[PDB]
Each structure stands twice: as structure tokens, then as C-alpha cells.
């Protein structure tokens, strides 16, 4: 149908059809008379997966022959989403499969909807890892993603009576056609035990063993025949585990305890919970991964070359135990001297920070590490002692610096600061957007920057244009390709060529047509699967991201209520119709976040049923926001809400997805919004509110929310409506906690940005009244979105941290 989706050759289509029928028969053990839609999905997945095998085997043998430096990306989260369409896109198989299935009497899009998301992440950090894997393969890097194969991913969100309910994400129930179990590469991981000091070195003894079984998933590069590996570990009890009939049976049942390690993803976004099971998960991935790395390195004794052949990237502090684990193996097992082992470790490891919120930073109680990982604790103490001796030599007499920089935090319970460990043990430390990286050097890691300035870098985040343009918005990808060709898909900077089309009447019409079609398609999705009715001609105002106070969904809520109150005051006055869509999951134990969701639905309940409002304002909570839903709503959006308090959103990546897909942005100068505005021009961005400096000034003075309440009559009305039970008639005090927080303990200064936000939103509505000028500004955004390709980001990691050169060169098919 459309060019960017590839060729549908006679030979290919015939071969796809016959292999589809072969799998339906031999693999699924079905015929066409009994086959269900799910059977058809699986037959297709197997048909496509067959095309990966040859390339996968030859990519890995190529790495064996050439022996390039290997990149190991360690993460507790990989938010992959669906794999079928992505695989077809990267293999140029989409049109061929579409044709083949069409001739078999099947709709491929319908089959694609059957696949479960691989929801092995919470949000931004997990999705970044996924985009990164795609870019690393597309850039021909010898890269491996290493993580955990959770049996249960991020929970499925159900909304019941306006409240979030959680249910287990049983994503493996029907099987996963995209993984290959590798039970022959199973490795032991050790826990507990004790440290024994012998004549020659320390020994870690009397441990309990859990097995780590790897599952490999292919990661195809974009049309370069490269297929890299994501290896995810699953926990397995050894056969003699816990080994009378009651006794025998119980011993077998108790194997569950060991296997619980990989059972479920911790559902916290930007928060630290010091649970033993989480620590076990963190060590489990680290221990199994490092053994795999060392084994592969030896199959190339001399560890001087280790950093020349290995890079380990730590996705935040979650796999920070890689540092003392590498030291443990090098010192205790390989018998290297401390100083050499340390040199190797530092040159191998690099650390990426993803948040400055203090509650999110990992600080593990010493007593936990003492029991679970006694040898690692000893190594951490030794690292700390040697590190502090260095600090003391550089800043003599600065006793407070010593305590501030210590890996060991004193207090009620002694804790290890994992971020401090990571900085000490890495040759590179980076933030994820220019403003964030500057904040790291100026505030939370200031002491470390002063000691080792060369270590600190920036690597602004990005998104893959494959999933986030070609896959989810083929219509836009096509109208761009018609003008500037196809090369932009792996060279997004080429989108700048679209600037010469900003006055092109045909292109303006095409951009606007593509958006309208996307909005119609999404409006049809909402009716079919949720029976909700929306005006497709209205401005699609969307805020999708995890529910957190710093992201300020509440500020959005305040604007929504302002609009409703204004309509009610002057009903027969024209307003630009809006569909306000808010979606995202709340962490199960985050009360305030759960209250915010209830508020959103409560506002919708009132607004959506007021006859005076009509089709002029609609408020919808998008249930179960996840990668597959993002691929649907983002292409349909007109306005992207990126309204975090300045200095709180490290980067954001949802922002980039919207920019690439033809939405305009209303946002604070926070995270990557700053660079987005810089790329597009501030005239082409709806910027409002406090900058970081303004927040700092307010903090010095003290933030008094009452001041705003007293001086803004429209804000007073909203608070009074909330408190009185206007939005909860049967439970008048339902939102008392929200009001109290806003008035008395608001860390994120919702009121301080209220006036500027509402004013800015009026300017959005004004522009939307002029479709031609709206679209022209959209073109200016898409055209300057190139910087935010994860290909750019990965190329920078490669050259500036890993010391490897990216390549767009094809491997033979
Ligand atoms: O090939 C497989 N997965 C794969 C292949 C290519 C790309 C992505 C995933 C796979 O899972 N094969 C399974 O191996 C089992 C033995 O190890 C067989 O019993 C299964 O029938 C087969 O599906
Ligand atoms: O810190 C994060 N997650 C987390 C933190 C602790 C425990 C589990 C997950 C996180 O997701 N941070 C986000 O990283 C994104 C990718 O760099 C950024 O775009 C976001 O700004 C940041 O909040």
C-alpha cells in the first residue's frame, strides 16, 4: 500500500503464505476449520521469526570472528512492548506480510492487536533501554542487553468506580514466540553465607545457590541484517534444593522461594523501596551477567585488555553491585591485586543517572548487605576507605566533605549510597539532558565533580524513529518520504529538509490530513473497545506518563476545571472544543497518585454529563497506559502536556515522541523540553512557568501557597469546589488530602505556575483557531526533531564513553 512499508514481491508473498500454513499445521497443530485469531497471530509470528534466525546466527559468528569491543547494557527494566510489527519494519517485511495475510483472508492489523506487550519496565527508564537496544543494532554495535525475565511485568490497570485496581500482567500465559530458552548456559548465583579469611585471600562460603537460566530475544537493526541479543535471566532452584513424605513434598514446594526472585517487576517509578527481594533481583542479574561477560572474554587470563574488550553501562544504580562483584571476581577468584582490579573495574564501568528526587535514590541498609552479601559489603568498605583517603589528600582538613562523599551514610540505620559507589567505580557519569547533567554537577554530585570533573558528561535522551514514527504513524512517515526520500529513518537529522516545505500548500494539507486520520482512527478505537464518545474535530489535549506529583497532572486538572467554570459562567460564548486525555499508572502504594486518578475521573463524571458543556469539553482517563497504547494515542495528539516543575523531570522521552508525531508542546523549561525548544525555536513552543532559578528563589523565600489562593479568585473557586464536595457529592470530603497537600505541603509548587499555565493555554486555543498556522508550526517541530533520535544518543555514548565507532554498513543477508 505505502512505500516505506517495503516491497510485496511475488516470490516473497508466495513463500510467506506457504510458511504460514506450515506453521499453522506443524507448529500450532491446527487446521483452518478450528484455528482461532490467536492461532493466526502465532503462525504469523513464527513465519516472521524464521527470517531472523539466519541473520541472528551470522551476526553472532561475525562478532566471534572480528572480536570487537562488546557493550553490555545492564538494566532491571526493558520496556519492549510488542515485537511483531517492529520485526517486520526492521526486516522490510511489512507490505509482504500484509499482502500474504490478505490473500489468506486475514487482516494483519487485527492479528497484531493479539500480541501482549512485553511490559518489563515501569516507564521512561525501561523504555529508554528498549529504544537504546534498537539504536545499538541499527548502528552495528556488538551490544547485549542484560536483565531479568519477569514472569509478571508492570500490572494491568483497571479503573473501578474511578479508582485504580491492579491485576497481574500474566504476559507469558500463551507463550512467547520471540524468546529462545538457553538452559545449557545456566549459571549459579550465590546468596548469604559467610566470609572466611585464609592464608591466601578471602573465601565466600556456606552460600545458598539459585540458578540463573538465560532466555535470548533477538534485537534486529533497521535493514542492516544485524540481529543483536537481549539476554534475560530467569531464576531456578537447584535440584537438591531443601533436599518423611510431608517433608519431601514441602521441600519440593519450597523451590518456589528461590524462583520468586524473577517472579515480578517492582512497580515503582521514581521511588526507592528497600525490600530484600529487590536487592536479590539486583544481585541476581549482576552476578549471572558478569559470569557470562568474563566467560565470553576468556573465549577470545590477562585482564589488562578487559576494558579494551568490555564496556558495562549501568542503567541507574539498580545494577550498581556490578562494581563490587567485578572486584570480587578479579580479587578473590582471579587473584589480581586490588589496585589493578580497581583500574580494570573503573575503566570498564560507566554510570547513567536518571533522577534527582532524593526519595528515589538507592540507599541500602548495611544490615541487609551484611546478611545477604557479606563479601560485597567488605569490598564496599574497602572502596570507601581508599576513596576517602583520596578525597582527604585533595581537600585536606575538609572533614564535612569526607562525610558528604562517603559511600557509607551514618544515622539511625547505616546505609550504603549506591550513587556514590557508582561514581567512585566508573570512568564516566552522565545525566540524560543538558539541564539535568548541569544540575548533577552543581547540586547533588557537586563534591564528586570537584574531585573528578573529567568523569561528568551529558548524553541527552532520544527515541527510536522506527517504533515512534514508521511503526506507529505510517501515514506521516509516507508523506515525509514522498518529499525527502527514505534515508531519514536511520538519519533523522534529514528531517531538517522539511523546513523548505513550511510554505508548501500541498504538504501543509497532507500533514493536517494525516493528523485528522489519526484522530479519527483513535476516536474509533475509543468507541469500539471502551464505548466512549469523543468529538474528533476537537483539540486532542493529552498528558500520558506515570502518575507522580512532580509531573503535575494536578496542574492539568486545575486548568480543566478553570475551563469548565468559564464555560458555566458564559455558556453562549465560543470556546475551542477540547478533548482532554490523561493516562498513566500509579504505583500501588502511592496514595496521593491514586487520589489524583480518582480526581481525574471525578472531574470527567461532572464535565462529561453537563448538558450546557455539550461537545465543547470532554475529560477522559486513558486506562492501562502502556507502550501499545502510546503507539495509538501519540500520533493522534494535537497538544503534548510536559508540565513538570522545573528541575524535576531529568529528561522526559514522551515529549520527543509527541514532537516527532505532529503535536505542539505546552511545557516548562525542564529536562529535554529546553533542548526541544532550542531546536525548534521558542516561538514554536508553548513555554510557560518558573525556570529552575525561579524555583530556587521561591525555596529561599519559602513557598506559601496561601498567597496564590488569596490573590487568584479563579483558583480560590476551584479549591472551594474541591473542598465542598462539588466533584464528590456523596463523599464531600473525598479530596481533603489533595486540598491539604496543595495548601500546606506541596513540594512541586502547583499554584505558582497556575496563572502562566492558564494564560499559555489560551494562546494554544487561539492558534488552533488558525489551522494553517497551527500546521505550519507543527511542520517546524517535526522538521527539527532530528536531534532526539536515539541513534544520535547512542552514537554519542559510543564515541564519548564506550570508545567504539558506529557503522551503518550492512551484513550480507
Ligand atoms: O526458536 C525459538 N525462538 C526464537 C527463534 C528465532 C527468533 C526468536 C525466537 C524457540 O523458542 N524454539 C523452541 O525451542 C525448543 C527447544 O529448545 C522447542 O521444543 C520449541 O518447539 C521451539 O519453539
Ligand atoms: O528513575 C526512574 N525509574 C526508577 C527509579 C527507581 C526505581 C525504579 C525505577 C526513571 O524512570 N527515571 C526517568 O528516566 C527517563 C529516561 O532517562 C527520563 O526521561 C525521565 O525524566 C526520568 O524520570
Curated annotation (Swiss-Prot):
SUPFAM superfamilies, per the entry: UDP-Glycosyltransferase/glycogen phosphorylase
Binding site for AMP: 31, 64, 295-300
Substrates-to-products reaction catalysed: [(1->4)-alpha-D-glucosyl](n) + phosphate = [(1->4)-alpha-D-glucosyl](n-1) + alpha-D-glucose 1-phosphate
GO CC entries: skeletal muscle myofibril
Classification via Pfam families: Phosphorylase
Residues carrying the site annotation Involved in the association of subunits: 97, 131
One BP annotation, GO: glycogen catabolic process
Site positions (Can be labeled by an AMP analog): 144
Gene3D superfamilies attached to this UniProt entry: Glycogen Phosphorylase B (3.40.50.2000)
Post-translational modification: Phosphorylation of Ser-3 converts phosphorylase B (unphosphorylated) to phosphorylase A.
N6-(pyridoxal phosphate)lysine: residues bearing it: 657
Gene Ontology MF terms: glycogen phosphorylase activity; nucleotide binding; pyridoxal phosphate binding
Keywords linked to the UniProt accession: Acetylation, Allosteric enzyme, Carbohydrate metabolism, Glycogen metabolism, Glycosyltransferase, Nucleotide-binding, Phosphoprotein, Pyridoxal phosphate, Transferase
Superkingdom to which the source organism belongs: Eukaryota
Phosphotyrosine modified-residue sites: 192, 215, 449
Enzyme class: transferase
Regulation: Allosterically regulated through the non-covalent binding of metabolites, being activated by AMP and inhibited by ATP, ADP, and glucose-6-phosphate. The activity is also controlled by post-translational modifications including phosphorylation.
Phosphoserine modified-residue sites: 3, 406, 490, 723-724
Quaternary assembly: Homodimer. Homotetramer; to form the enzymatically active phosphorylase A.
NCBIfam families reported in the protein's UniProt record: P_ylase (TIGR02093)
Purpose: Allosteric enzyme that catalyzes the rate-limiting step in glycogen catabolism, the phosphorolytic cleavage of glycogen to produce glucose-1-phosphate, and plays a central role in maintaining cellular and organismal glucose homeostasis.
Family indicated by similarity: Belongs to the glycogen phosphorylase family.
Record-given protein name: Glycogen phosphorylase, muscle form
Natural source organism: Oryctolagus cuniculus (Rabbit)
Amino acid at each position: 500500500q505505502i512505500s516505506v512499508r517495503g516491497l510485496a514481491g511475488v516470490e516473497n508473498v508466495t513463500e510467506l503464505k506457504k510458511n504460514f500454513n506450515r506453521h499453522l499445521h506443524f507448529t500450532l497443530v491446527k487446521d483452518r476449520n478450528v484455528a482461532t485469531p490467536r492461532d493466526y497471530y502465532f503462525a504469523l509470528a513464527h513465519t516472521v521469526r524464521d527470517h531472523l534466525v539466519g541473520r541472528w546466527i551470522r551476526t553472532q559468528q561475525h562478532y566471534y570472528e572480528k572480536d570487537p569491543k562488546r557493550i553490555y547494557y545492564l538494566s532491571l527494566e526493558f520496556y519492549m512492548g510488542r515485537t511483531l510489527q517492529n520485526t517486520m519494519v526492521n526486516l522490510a517485511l511489512e507490505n509482504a506480510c500484509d499482502e500474504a495475510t490478505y490473500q489468506l483472508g486475514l487482516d494483519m492489523e487485527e492479528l497484531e492487536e493479539i500480541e501482549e506487550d512485553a511490559g518489563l519496565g515501569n516507564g521512561g527508564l525501561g523504555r529508554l533501554a528498549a529504544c537504546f537496544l534498537d539504536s545499538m543494532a541499527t548502528l552495528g554495535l556488538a551490544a547485549y542487553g542484560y536483565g531479568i525475565r519477569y514472569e509478571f511485568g508492570i500490572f494491568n490497570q483497571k479503573i473501578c468506580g474511578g479508582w485504580q485496581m491492579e491485576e497481574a500482567d500474566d504476559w507469558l500465559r500463551y507463550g512467547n514466540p520471540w524468546e529462545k530458552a538457553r538452559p545449557e548456559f545456566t549459571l549459579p548465583v550465590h546468596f548469604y553465607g559467610r566470609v572466611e579469611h585464609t592464608s591466601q585471600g578471602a573465601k565466600w562460603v556456606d552460600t545458598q545457590v539459585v540458578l540463573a537460566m538465560p532466555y535470548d530475544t533477538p534485537v534486529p537493526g533497521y535493514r542492516n541484517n544485524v540481529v543483536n541479543t537481549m539476554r534475560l535471566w530467569s531464576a531456578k532452584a537447584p535440584n537438591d534444593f531443601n533436599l518423611n513424605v510431608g517433608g519431601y513434598i514441602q521441600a519440593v514446594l519450597d523451590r518456589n522461594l528461590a524462583e520468586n526472585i524473577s517472579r515480578v517487576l517492582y512497580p515503582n517509578d521514581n521511588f526507592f523501596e528497600g525490600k530484600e527481594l529487590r536487592l536479590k533481583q539486583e544481585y541476581f542479574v549482576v552476578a549471572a551477567t558478569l559470569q557470562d561477560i568474563i566467560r565470553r572474554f576468556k573465549s577470545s587470563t590477562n585482564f589488562d585488555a578487559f576494558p579494551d574488550k568490555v564496556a558495562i553501562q549501568l542503567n541507574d544504580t539498580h545494577p550498581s553491585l556490578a562494581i563490587p562483584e567485578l572486584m570480587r571476581v578479579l580479587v578473590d577468584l582471579e587473584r589480581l591485586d586490588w589496585d589493578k582490579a580497581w583500574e580494570v573495574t573503573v575503566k570498564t564501568c560507566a554510570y547513567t543517572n536518571h533522577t534527582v528526587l532524593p526519595e528515589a535514590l538507592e540507599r541500602w541498609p548495611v544490615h541487609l548487605l551484611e546478611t545477604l552479601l557479606p563479601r560485597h559489603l567488605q569490598i564496599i568498605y574497602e572502596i570507601n576507605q581508599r576513596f576517602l583517603n583520596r578525597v582527604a589528600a585533595a581537600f585536606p582538613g575538609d572533614v564535612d566533605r569526607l562525610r558528604r562523599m562517603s559511600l557509607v551514610e551514618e544515622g539511625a540505620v547505616k546505609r550504603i549510597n549506591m550513587a556514590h559507589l557508582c561514581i567512585a567505580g566508573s570512568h564516566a557519569v552522565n545525566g540524560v539532558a543538558r539541564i539535568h547533567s548541569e544540575i548533577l554537577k552543581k547540586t547533588i554530585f557537586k563534591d564528586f565533580y570537584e574531585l573528578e570533573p573529567h568523569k561528568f558528561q551529558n548524553k541527552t535522551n532520544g527515541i527510536t524513529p522506527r517504533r515512534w514514527l514508521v511503526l506507529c504513524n505510517p501515514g506521516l512517515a509516507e508523506i515525509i518520504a514522498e518529499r525527502i526520500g527514505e534515508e531519514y529513518i536511520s538519519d533523522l537529522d534529514q528531517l531538517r529538509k522539511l523546513l523548505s516545505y513550511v510554505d508548501d500548500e500541498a504538504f501543509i494539507r497532507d500533514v493536517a490530513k494525516v493528523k485528522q486520520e489519526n484522530k479519527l482512527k483513535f476516536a474509533a478505537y475509543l468507541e469500539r473497545e471502551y464505548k466512549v464518545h469523543i468529538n474528533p474535530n476537537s483539540l486532542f489535549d493529552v498528558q500520558v506518563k506515570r502518575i507522580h506529583e512532580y509531573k503535575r497532572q494536578l496542574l492539568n486538572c486545575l486548568h480543566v476545571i478553570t475551563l469548565y467554570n468559564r464555560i458555566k459562567k458564559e455558556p453562549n460564548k465560543f470556546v475551542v472544543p477540547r478533548t482532554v486525555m490523561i493516562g498513566g499508572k500509579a504505583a500501588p502504594g502511592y496514595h496521593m497518585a491514586k487520589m489524583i486518578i480518582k480526581l481525574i475521573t471525578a472531574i470527567g463524571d461532572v464535565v462529561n454529563h453537563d448538558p450546557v458543556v455539550g461537545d465543547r469539553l470532554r475529560v477522559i482517563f486513558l486506562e492501562n497506559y502502556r507502550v501499545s497504547l502510546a503507539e495509538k494515542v501519540i500520533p493522534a495528539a494535537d497538544l503534548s502536556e510536559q508540565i513538570s516543575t522545573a528541575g524535576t523531570e531529568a529528561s522526559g522521552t514522551g515529549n520527543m515522541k509527541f514532537m516527532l508525531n505532529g503535536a505542539l508542546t505546552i511545557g516548562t523549561m525542564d529536562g529535554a523540553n529546553v533542548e526541544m525548544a532550542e531546536e525548534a525555536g521558542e516561538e514554536n513552543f508553548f513555554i510557560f512557568g518558573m525556570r529552575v532559578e525561579d524555583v530556587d528563589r521561591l525555596d529561599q523565600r519559602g513557598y506559601n501557597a496561601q498567597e496564590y489562593y488569596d490573590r487568584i479568585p479563579e483558583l480560590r473557586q476551584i479549591i472551594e469546589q474541591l473542598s465542598s464536595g462539588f466533584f464528590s457529592p456523596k463523599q464531600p470530603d473525598l479530596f481533603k488530602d489533595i486540598v491539604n497537600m496543595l495548601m500546606h505541603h506541596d513540594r512541586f509548587k502547583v499554584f505558582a505556575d497556575y496563572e502562566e499555565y492558564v494564560k499559555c493555554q489560551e494562546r494554544v486555543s487561539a492558534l488552533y483557531k488558525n489551522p494553517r498556522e497551527w500546521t505550519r508550526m507543527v511542520i517546524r517541530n517535526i522538521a527539527t526533531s532530528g536531534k532526539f533520535s536515539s541513534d544520535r544518543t547512542i552514537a554519542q555514548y559510543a564515541r564519548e564513553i564506550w570508545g567504539v565507532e558506529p557503522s551503518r554498513q550492512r551484513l550480507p543477508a
